[PDB]
Symmetry: D2
Subunit: 248 residues, 4 copies
């Protein structure tokens, strides 16, 4: 069985693929733009992916990878009544480029299903886009669309660390995503069946995408403090307890 894993407790440019406004500052992955004084700027889009492609499924053998990722993020809004747009963990084709900003989170073009995007994302959505969104802040699973196939309520705590765990089990095709705000003692969970052989190419880049608002005042930070990933592809035909010790 082929294995790949990593743990970034601090970040570095050298092992990341940085796109647009995404930047490493003082060991922190700052996906969207912040001023020298620490003011988040509007109209920002940023992306970061790991420098090594991950084989998510094998066409010749029919094997599917089981994988898990954990990260700690922090969305900090100067004014909570007006922030946007959110951040997401995504699997994209290898040389994949950013798409629409704002509510599309740098990952999608529109609300309708476009299979040629070949993108799976778990979004953490700070802004009510209504054109497609549920009423409150939510975690969603995005398959080739910004219009999540399933969501769950997220009691987002402004400027407070969120510790995320996303797991994919090959044998049940189940994608699970959970968020914890340790300072609030709150927790949230989403689970949906996703067939990755239907959605993603055999090889993907894993990482993050985030945006700020399309208006001057709708601003927030989209920072990632730590990140851990592990994947296991069987040859023919994920120890999770040991994995979250690495990251969250």
């Amino acid at each position: 069985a082929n294995l790949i894993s990593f743990t970034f407790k601090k970040f570095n440019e050298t092992n990341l693929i940085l796109q647009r406004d995404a930047t490493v500052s003082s060991g922190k992955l700052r996906i969207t733009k912040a001023a020298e004084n620490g003011v988040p700027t509007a109209g920002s889009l940023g992306r970061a992916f790991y420098s090594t492609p991950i084989q998510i499924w094998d066409n010749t053998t029919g094997t599917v990878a089981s994988w898990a990722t954990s990260f700690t993020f922090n969305l900090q809004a100067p004014n909570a009544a007006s922030p946007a747009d959110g951040l997401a963990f995504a699997l994209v084709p290898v040389g994949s480029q950013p798409k629409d900003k704002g509510g599309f989170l740098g990952l999608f073009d529109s609300k309708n299903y476009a299979s040629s995007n070949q993108t799976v994302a778990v979004e953490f959505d700070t802004f009510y886009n209504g054109g497609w969104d549920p009423t409150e802040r939510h975690i969603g699973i995005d398959v080739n669309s910004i219009k999540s196939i399933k969501t769950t309520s997220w009691d987002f705590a402004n400027g407070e660390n969120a510790e995320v765990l996303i797991t994919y089990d090959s044998s049940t095709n189940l994608l699970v995503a959970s968020l914890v705000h340790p300072s609030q003692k709150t927790s949230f969970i989403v689970s949906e069946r996703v067939d990755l052989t239907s959605v993603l190419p055999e090889w993907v880049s894993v990482g993050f995408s985030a945006t700020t608002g399309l208006s001057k005042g709708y601003v927030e930070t989209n920072e990632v403090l730590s990140w851990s990933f592990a994947s296991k592809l069987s040859i023919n035909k994920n120890k999770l307890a040991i994995f979250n010790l690495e990251g969250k």
Copy 2:
């Protein structure tokens, strides 16, 4: 840093401490009694712990272990309208013996706080005991009492696998417990601050406790299909993504 981990995809008597009705049958940990025909029996109590003690905190250094556990369980009731009582993952003192059966799950004596029990448990409670329980099936965190310090709703699916992840972070003192029913695509999550140095002895046995009803007809299986554990104790002063690959 001292480390300990294991993964049981199948079970064996030889590395377990079996108490009361708990038994290994065909590689499955059957905590409570089942007939030769496969009929769950009432009035049953069973416990299983790992044969090696886990240091959960160090008095001399002040260090606290971070740990994670994942398991898959299956509660199967012939009649869903009348089952009891549930199963729990517990940390108990090393030579610890079973307590009250039924709604006390083999772990506690009463509803009031008794610190000398020194027991932390995450319960999966199939039965409304009301004397202390919420109205529906629930996951709860038990600290020296059967009366959980916090609960969350559990849409229990009869005879369907439940994949559980329990994590404890030393730095935030946060115990998180999540349950997934992959066949239903449902998921549930509980999080509460627990100071283990206040609750548990330095050394504990980790494992499971379960009971059937205190009436002839209130019967269910309490089976554990797989189990994974990992713990990390720093010397002075948990990679989770890699851990759940091991178990769930």
Copy 3:
């Protein structure tokens, strides 16, 4: 696949089976007796095993475990021209008791093959017993006999740390043992085919055995500073890179 591992950077009585003179002092596993002033005593025998049994092979499936262990030891002799006897890493039957002291290292009765001992050991032999030993200090593989089936020269550095790696590959039946003296930049290696299904019971205790001389003046310490173990048993049919990081 069933997994078991641990890493002791410091030692504790609570997760060990201590036999005879073996003792934990200031986080160090002291296999043989030392005075309050730090003087090693003669005629000493000591043993330490992990509290959880390891399944080394499965009779019903025919599967054999692959395993690896790493430890750092220190043999300190007041007078190098007169020390004895050495220390060994051993796999013994579960409730196994010490045997002959001195040159037999607490593991064997005699030089002739006795299959009922069911013991595999990698010895680090400080003393020329001649009755069976090579001329100089040696690493040997012991199968049911103190008379090694294969040895290699060991340029033992008195009172200097030795970092050991022992690996067993199920698919090649190859036991490899290596010793490094980092302060000397020296290294030594032994490899021999051993069929464990022929030698060991299905379940074993893993750990250490050591002895001091059978004369007043032939004295040394037999200390173990750190210890790491991992084993993997397939269900029906070892990552050494990551192992020795955690390991050594």
Copy 4:
């Protein structure tokens, strides 16, 4: 602490940086050219490195990474009396290009110390270059020169798998390299102190380099069957047991 690891039981172009003749064929990394009939060709040079750079030391904190790698290789010569030249595991600067072929193994220019190459390599040298080589087949440690700073005898078994383990301990600055031929039950070991902060840049590519002879008839395969790597960089201040299970 930042972590990185992988295990290739089979190979893929997508996560490798392939240079010159190096190619992936049927899941095997074939470093040097082979004909369609399976005939090794002369005058070949090939290199393969992992697509993610490894931080081997940190200038700002003074921290040095501990790392380990394990691989299985196979050198197959049609005529043993005339093969060349060998293969090596190397750490090179990130965008580093191949150097001289033949006896220089694609890694070096000459025998004299050139610090600007910034290359550490463990060589497995099939050919007596005399200009710098010991008389028989050898494992050597190469620091900025093809003239090894230390070697050891290698009883090379033609067309037989060699299982290699290379470890670097930050605290002792010790590089250890061992080779096992499981079919022969033979083993070999080399150890030397290397200060990596003196030799390598902070970031390196890890991987392999190999060459065939500079004469028509001096031909061999230089195949790598599996490969595992793990590295650990502390923030301010390696479990080998578990590593070599996943590893080898």
